[PDB]
Homo-oligomer: A and B are copies of this chain.
Amino acid sequence: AETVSFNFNSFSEGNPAINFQGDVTVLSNGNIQLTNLNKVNSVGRVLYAMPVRIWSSATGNVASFLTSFSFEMKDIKDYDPADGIIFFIAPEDTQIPAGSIGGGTLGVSDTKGAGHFVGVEFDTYSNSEYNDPPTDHVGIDVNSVDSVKTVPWNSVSGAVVKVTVIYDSSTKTLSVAVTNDNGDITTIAQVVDLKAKLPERVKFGFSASGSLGGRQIHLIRSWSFTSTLITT
C-alpha cells in the first residue's frame, strides 16, 4: 500500500511541510491564524506541501483517508463574525482565485461561487447569493460554495471544535463528525466521486476569508492525516 501520514500538534514558521497562501500568520503559541484582521477581503490558506496521489489511472484505485483537526473562531469588536473556514482538496496547482473578493467565497471560489475543489465548510454568515441556509451550518462543497448538502450548526466564539472526516474509497462516501464544545455531535455524509472531480495528485489544506465589515479570528490548532492507496 502507498500511505501518507502526518501529525501537527502545533505549527512553526519555516517548516517545509506547510505552504502558506495569503494572510496566514503563525502565532507565538503554535496556532495558525488564517486572516488579517486589518485587511479588507482578507484571505489566508494553509496546505500540506506534498501533493498526495488520491487515485491512479494505472490501476483505477482511489485512496481512502482519515483526518482530524480542531479549530476555533473568535469574535472581535465592531465586525460581523464572518465568514468561516473550509477544509478543502484541490488540484496541485491550487492558488487563491485571481481577483478574490474573500467574504462568502471562503477563499476557494470565484465571485459567482464556483471553483475546482471538494471541501467541508463551517459557515458563519448567510449569503443569499450562494443559497446559504439561514443559520450557521456545516456543508459539503463540490466545485461551488452553494453546498451540495448542509446541516444546521452553531459557531461558539472562543469554543474549540474537533472534527473527524472519513473518506471510504469503495462507497465513495465522505463522512464528517463535528464535536461541539457542549458535547453534542453533528454529522453529515455525502457520496462524492473524487476520481471524477479531481486530478490524480491533489493538495489538502484549510482556507478562511473575511470582508470589509465581516471579520473574526480564524485559528487552526492541530491536524493529523493518513491516506492509503492500494498499490498495484
Contact = CB atoms under 8 A, between A and B. Distances in A.
A10 B74 CA distance: 9
Interface in A1-48: 1-7, 9-10, 12, 14-17, 25, 27-31, 33, 37
Given A31-B29, A219-B29, A15 B53 contact: yes
A177 interface: yes
A182 B7 contact: yes
A33 B185 CA distance: 27
A37 B28 contact: yes
Contact of A175 (B5, B72, B175): B175
Interface in A154-171: 157-158, 160, 164, 166-171
A12 B16 contact: no
A186 interface: yes
A49 B50 CA distance: 8
A177 B16 contact: no
Contact of A12 (B28, B157, B182, B232): B232
Interface residues of A, number: 69
Contact of A29 (B16, B72, B166, B168): B72
A147 B94 CA distance: 42
A83 B66 CA distance: 27
A3 B224 CA distance: 12
A64 B187 CA distance: 7
Interface of A: 1-7, 9-10, 12, 14-17, 25, 27-31, 33, 37, 49-53, 56, 58, 64-66, 72, 74, 151, 157-158, 160, 164, 166-171, 173, 175-177, 179, 182-190, 201, 217, 219, 221-222, 226-228, 231-232
